[model samples]
Target: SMEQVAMELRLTELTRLLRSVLDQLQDKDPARIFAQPVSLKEVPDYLDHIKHPMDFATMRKRLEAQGYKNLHEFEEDFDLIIDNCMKYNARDTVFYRAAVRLRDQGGVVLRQARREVDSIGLE
Candidate 1:
């Protein structure tokens, strides 16, 4: 129980740190380009480098079936995925970074949309 609790706390902290980073990026590049839903067509490129058992089709299907709106939604599955990677003696860094990339892209999309709305000028 203690270990699980500690793991959860760490995960929460990681998410918080990521959110802060996203905020800072948005502040720096308010007009950054972003793609909503992160383009399924680009999914292959995003995930192709990772050495994983799941194929692109299956991964896409799973995400769609689960109604995944953003990478943050995938956080729930991170621990299990990383643990599995460890069991196979695989480098888990890529998988973690891939998730971060997705999150950052989605964050940019959201931030850009917010900026657009705020910049509406009716003079």
Candidate 2:
């Protein structure tokens, strides 16, 4: 029972990390994922969401399909989107830092997350 629970927890953590990485990328450049001008606020709707660690070829095709003929145009759009989201997320990470310190006292993984938050310059 303990082993099963631990496995589930580990899987959840891994999936969440993967999804977060992808979300960051997709949020950075939705055109890299879908052939739509998916709004930043409406990002949660894409199944079309980009997966992580993308190469230029894959990124180019997706954006081009969305009528973005020049890669520079998409890169510009992506920079704007990334700037907006990362600024917001940087603020949110502060709250996560606080929560981690407050709730993660005993457990190993939670403590690890807490340590990470602390190392990120949070108390």
Candidate 3:
């Protein structure tokens, strides 16, 4: 079914996006932080806080996850997202900000990633 295919494609994109993000973070080799995959049951809370990507300050704060605080003394050593996802216009002001975030980092998987599923040859 179209729905099934769409879901699969979306899942693939999300996996790719996450891998890309983690890859970049790992490359920086900052303070030896860890990146463990979250569980499906924990999706709600993660989604609740998962940033749209653009809000430099918002996403920046989140980027410092797991009790990791900003260096404060020195600059971050990675290309952190400082913009929003413009591809998908956000309904709310913050969502619009999300576009900015995605543009800076990368757009949200559910939003921009889902769009890819639309191309599936469905009837």
TM-score per candidate: 0.30, 0.27, 0.27
Number of clashes found in candidate 1: 0
Q: Could you give the candidate ranking by TM-score, starting with the highest?
A: 1, 3, 2
Best by lDDT: 1
Backbone clashes, candidate 3: 18
Tens-place lDDT per residue, model 3, 1-123, is 998877666555544443445445444333222122333384445435435322233333444442222222111212223221233334566535543443344333334433433453211
The digit string of per-residue lDDT tens for model 1 on 54-97 reads: 32233334544533333444333332333333443334665444
In terms of TM-score, how similar is model 3 to the real structure? 0.27
Comparing candidate 1 with candidate 2, which one achieves the higher lDDT? 1
Clashing pairs in 1: none
Regions of candidate 2 where Cα sits further than 4 Å from its true position: 32-123
